[PDB]
């Protein structure tokens, strides 16, 4: 079976964007 | 003390550990271990890009529990694809390579051990290590993936070297 946790390059960068913006409190 | 994904983080399929060495076993030193995409980017944000170093240096990114040396039990029967790079390419190629590795893009099961970027005098070298050098289906698939994720020119030379040689 495939691995559970597969990320495309774009998905990796989408997560980086989210991380970058978290200087503001949710 | 186990490293695990934080709440609401995107887990990785394996824990990975950043290492470095600088020419000046314990030549190769651990930086830290991470379990999620977010933790990865946090670690990465503290590291100089390999293209911004000019002294003899290496970064290593290996699955947790695998030492970045061929004598490690996980590497002993393995080998690596090597690509030599003119100066100016290593930073982008390193980033593309480790994103592919972390994101499970090679699709070779447990075979990947880790990746290395080496800064040398007039070139840099990037490599990806796997467990079984004699597994031609695996090494061929790794090669195909490298071609796709590195985005280097089509005539780019890649070489496979078995560690015991």
Residue numbers in the entry:
A (entry chain B): 49 to 74
B (entry chain A): 45 to 68, 79 to 219
Q: What does the original paper state about this entry?
A:
In this study, we identified aminoacyl-tRNA synthetase-mediated cap-dependent vertebrate-specific translation initiation machinery and investigated its structure, function, and molecular mechanism. TRS exhibits dual functionality to determine the vertebrate specificity of the machinery via its unique N-terminal extension that represents a gain-of-function component, and its ability to select target mRNAs. In the present study, we discovered that TRS regulates vertebrate-specific translation initiation. Thus, its association with either complex was somewhat diminished compared with the other components. These results suggest that TRS acts as an eIF4G-like scaffold and represents an eIF4F analog that acts independently of eIF4F.
The canonical motif of UNE-T is located in a position similar to that in the complexes of 4E-BP1–4EHP15, GIGYF1/2–4EHP15, 4E-BP1-eIF4E16, and eIF4G-eIF4E17. The residue corresponding to Lϕ in the consensus sequence is substituted by Mϕ in TRS. Residues Gly30−Asn48 in TRS were also not observed in the electron density map; hence these flexible regions were not included in the final model. Based on these results, we propose a schematic model for the TRS-mediated translation initiation machinery. The TRS ABD determines the selectivity of mRNAs by mimicking tRNA anticodon binding. PABP then integrates into the complex via interaction with the TRS ABD to form the efficient translation initiation machinery. Eventually, TRS links the complex to the ribosome via interaction with eIF3 to promote translation initiation. Herein, we identified a translation initiation machinery resulting from an evolutionary gain-of-function that is unique to vertebrates.
